[PDB]
Each structure stands twice: as structure tokens, then as C-alpha cells.
């Protein structure tokens with residue numbers, strides 16, 4: 001979630017240009033962003049974002065069932081740029097944005113907007129209203145060509161802030177040995193327990209939560225770190241760049 005990024009990285013964009021969502025949403029899926037090639041000072045323009053994905057395909061939910069995906073993003077604008085205030089946003093534009101509540105990454109970083117989690121069904125495409133700055137007032141911005149960084153995500157991440165995996169990833173054998181048994185868990189608890197008899201006869205038991213499907217069976221021998229399930233993840237993260245020129249009016 002965008003809040004996980006806000007709570008674990010002062011700056012969402014790393015030196016090499018990679019966005020921190022990429023530290024937990026490990027699969028890549030293309031995204032697109034579009035802004036006008038140029039804008040006048042203190043003006044309201046729009047950024048249009050695409051977070052494409054097949055909506056017929058469902059993901060593994062936290063509870064282990066299948067279901068809809070949620071989207072979120074981070075928009076890194078130049079110093080000085082900021083979310084357009086409600087009163088400066090055209091009604092036609094207001095309707096386009098919908099019931100979305102963009103927010104600064106931090107109170108001190110008003111040029112970094114985030115949003116989500118929100119339903120992917122209705123927000124596969126998002127419109128963000130930005131207020132261009134004015135160098136004639138702000139010493140920190142000039143009439144240049146500025147870069148714009150974007151990061152969009154679809155689906156539940158594979159790793160939590162504490163470092164543990166979610167149920168939306170590949171599970172591997174904790175040891176090498178023969179699979180002596182595969183017990184399904186409850187009916188409400190879901191998942192399976194895969195008992196592996198090691199060379200020394202000791203039997204370890206790998207717990208696999210509901211979500212991913214098994215690709216092994218009783219009698220099969222596996223190596224340590226060998227995948228026991230498929231890769232359930234159907235979401236993805238993506239980054240895109242663009243740029244905008246901050247025009248200099250001339251009277």
C-alpha cells in the first residue's frame with residue numbers, strides 16, 4: 001500500500017530511478033502517464049494515468065479466495081508543483097477525477113502524490129489535477145523542461161514490511177526429500193501441509209496457505225528450495241516517465 005511506502009522510505013524514488021513499490025510488488029506490468037507537453041505558470045493541467053490489466057482474471061485475496069484487484073500509485077512531480085485545490089478545478093474535470101482523494105507523500109513533499117488502494121474496476125484509469133508553480137514567486141522553480149516520474153500498481157504485494165511473504169507467491173521446499181504426505185487443511189482454514197521425509201528420516205512439514213495451487217504430489221522427491229506451487233500473482237507494478245515544459249509568459 002502507498003502507506004507502506006510512506007512509512008518506510010523518506011523518498012519513494014531511488015538514485016537509479018527505481019520506485020520503492022518495486023521492493024514488494026515484484027512482478028512488472030506496464031503503465032502509462034500523460035501530461036501536456038507544456039503549461040503556463042499557476043495553471044491547472046491534467047495527468048492521465050493508465051494501469052492496464054485483464055479484469056476477467058482474478059487475484060488471490062488475503063483470505064485465500066479469488067477476487068478483484070485494487071490499484072494505487074505515486075506521482076513524483078517537480079519541486080513546486082502541487083495537487084490542484086478543489087476551487088481551481090473545473091467541474092468537467094472534477095467529474096473526470098471521480099471520488100479519488102490524492103494525497104501528498106508527506107506534508108513536506110506536496111509535489112509527490114499518492115492514491116489507493118482503490119478498486120481497479122473503476123480506476124484502471126485515473127485523472128490527476130495539478131497546479132503548476134510560478135517561478136515569478138517561487139525561487140525554487142524555473143522555466144525549464146521538468147521530468148515527471150510515475151509508479152502504478154495492481155494487486156496484492158508479495159512481501160510485508162516485516163519481511164514475511166504473503167499468500168500471493170511461490171512457496172518452496174524447506175528441505176530436500178520425498179513427499180510422504182499432503183494433507184488439506186480444514187475447509188475454512190484452507191491450504192495444505194506437505195510432509196517431507198529427509199534423507200535422515202526426519203520429517204519436516206511445510207505449511208502452505210490457501211491461494212497458490214500445488215504442483216507436486218505424494219511420492220515425488222524434491223530438492224531444497226524447489227517450488228512446491230505455481231506463481232499465483234496476477235498483478236504487477238510499472239513505472240513510466242514523461243516531462244513537461246513550464247512556459248514563461250511574455251507581456
Ligand code: HEC
Pocket residue numbers: 001002004005008012020021022023024025059062068069070071072073074114116117118151152153154155156157158159160161166
Ligand atoms: C512492501 C513493504 C510494500 C510496499 C513498499 C508497498 N506495498 Fe503495496 N502491498 C504490499 C503487500 C504485502 C500488499 C498486500 C497487503 C494485504 O494485506 O493483502 C500490498 C497491497 C497493495 C495494494 C492492494 C491491492 C489489492 O488488490 O488489494 C495496492 C493497490 C498497493 N499495495 C499499492 C502500492 C503502491 C502504489 C506502492 C508504492 C507507492 C506500494 N504498494 C508499496 C506491500 C507493499
